């Protein structure tokens, strides 16, 4: 019905990574998350949306 969601930005390094490791798999575990969050220097709530929101625009009949 509206739209006044802000999302954030993500860096080549973040949305090619991201990308290289959801590409092959969307899951991630406790120890995983913290893993790239603190890696990546990202936080444990982006990459969870990050996965999210890629998967949505993933089309594959619903």
Same mark, same amino acid.
């Given at each position: 019905?509206? $739209?006044? @969601?802000?999302?954030?930005?993500?860096?080549?390094?973040? +949305?090619?990574?991201?990308? *290289?490791?959801?590409?092959? /798999?969307?899951?991630?575990?406790? $120890?995983r @998350?913290?893993?790239?969050?603190?890696?990546?220097?990202? +936080?444990?709530?982006?990459? *969870?949306?990050?996965?999210? /929101?890629?998967?949505?625009k993933?089309?594959?009949?619903?």
């Open positions: 019905g509206t $739209r006044r @969601r802000g999302r954030q930005t993500y860096t080549r390094f973040q +949305t090619l990574e991201l990308e *290289k490791e959801f590409h092959f /798999n969307h899951y991630l575990t406790r $120890r @998350r913290i893993e790239i969050a603190h890696a990546l220097c990202l +936080t444990e709530r982006q990459i *969870k949306i990050w996965f999210q /929101n890629r998967r949505m993933l089309k594959k009949e619903l």
